[PDB]
């Protein structure tokens, strides 16, 4: 009665104490190599990989590689390439079927930032994606390094 | 009521696993960069930028540039700036009225550490603040470069 | 009473925000120099250094150095080492009796993956041990450098 009201302020602090403390938490995570868009966060590992094993650091993380899904997502992954500098790739491939790109799991694009003239599969060898500084994306090989940014 | 008491013995089993789990995870986060104090936590992002590139990097993450205040929380620094073996910059300038140090706010110091004969305003243009790996202070020149080191 | 009923209720809904939020942001923590198994978490500093201060930095930092004391707790290390392709070293030494490799607290080894030979106290001066990408144990001179991996 009178003992379980006591008992419940006390909850009450704590619980007030750990929304206070994981909110500064956060902050500190994020800085300075992430970046939290809507219920996402796209975090740099800091250093660049070739496509294979930057999707397979990203998958053994728990998350994937960065896949913008909006002008909103996309605006909160080139802070983190403007940040360190250096284009990043995307989780999007077009590996299976020349010419039609799509996500990890297989669906189709619902999105996309290309630059002018791109994809153009150039050589006939460019089945991954980047994004530049400015934001925009371009089909590059697989096999060049870029730095690697996953989604969590 | 007796329903009731269960149930705040069971939230709070949960609540406090997660206190514990949350203490852990925050040491973790700490280590390597990053110095608690207080109820402020310093972190460095590892890398050299001019006074104006600094302040933005930290005040976009939600925080600000470092501002010991105390002995304690200049100690604290102090250590971030060792481990790095780079000189770092405070949040304070005389910008406004030259011989006049204030925090972002415009509020006075009430706390300073300078090193002997400073500060000296060297060629008559130095309103930024550093802190050296002994800990004292120095006013240098804003457009010099120095660790970047945020507080939340 | 009914009102603490409703106190009751709206905790609920506040811990299991956190318990989501809690739940992402650990992956997160966790990416790219963390790796949690069971109850404990290493992670390493990225860069090297000798015995003696590799150990003081996890010390300070509330932790130790890495200790594996299962096969599953040192597949994880592995795994970690492996990433970054750099030899750590562990927290266990035979600086006080020769031959008698301990962790800090002087409790005798529970597990051990040493490579073939070893440990030989090679050219009588080898009192701490490394472990290198294949997961193997080296005895090693504490003077030398290694990665720095804590555990928390
Ligand atoms: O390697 C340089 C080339 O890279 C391609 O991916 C791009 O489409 C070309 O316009 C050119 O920039
Ligand atoms: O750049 C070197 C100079 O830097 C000034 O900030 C300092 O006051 C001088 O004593 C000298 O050290
Ligand atoms: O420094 C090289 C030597 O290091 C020792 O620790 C090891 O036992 C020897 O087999 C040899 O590898
Ligand atoms: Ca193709
Ligand atoms: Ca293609
Ligand atoms: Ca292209
Ligand atoms: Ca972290
Ligand atoms: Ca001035
Ligand atoms: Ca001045
Ligand atoms: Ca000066
Ligand atoms: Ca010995
Ligand atoms: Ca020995
Ligand atoms: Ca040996």
Redesign the pocket.
């Given at each position: 009665v009178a003992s379980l009201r006591q008992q419940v302020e006390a909850l009450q602090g704590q619980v007030q104490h750990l929304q206070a403390a994981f909110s500064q938490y956060k902050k500190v995570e994020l800085f300075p190599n992430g970046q939290s868009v809507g219920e996402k966060i796209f975090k740099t590992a800091g250093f660049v990989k070739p496509f294979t094993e930057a999707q397979l650091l990203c998958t053994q993380a728990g998350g994937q590689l960065a896949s913008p899904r909006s002008a909103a997502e996309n605006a909160a992954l080139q802070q983190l390439v403007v940040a360190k500098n250096e284009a990043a790739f995307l989780s999007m491939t077009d590996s299976k079927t020349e010419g039609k790109f799509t996500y990890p799991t297989g669906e189709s694009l619902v999105y996309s930032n290309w630059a002018p003239?791109?994809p153009?599969d150039?050589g006939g060898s460019?089945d991954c994606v980047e994004i530049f500084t400015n934001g925009k994306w371009?089909?590059?090989a697989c096999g060049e390094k870029r730095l690697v940014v996953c989604e969590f």
């Open positions: 003239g791109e153009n150039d460019e371009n089909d590059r």
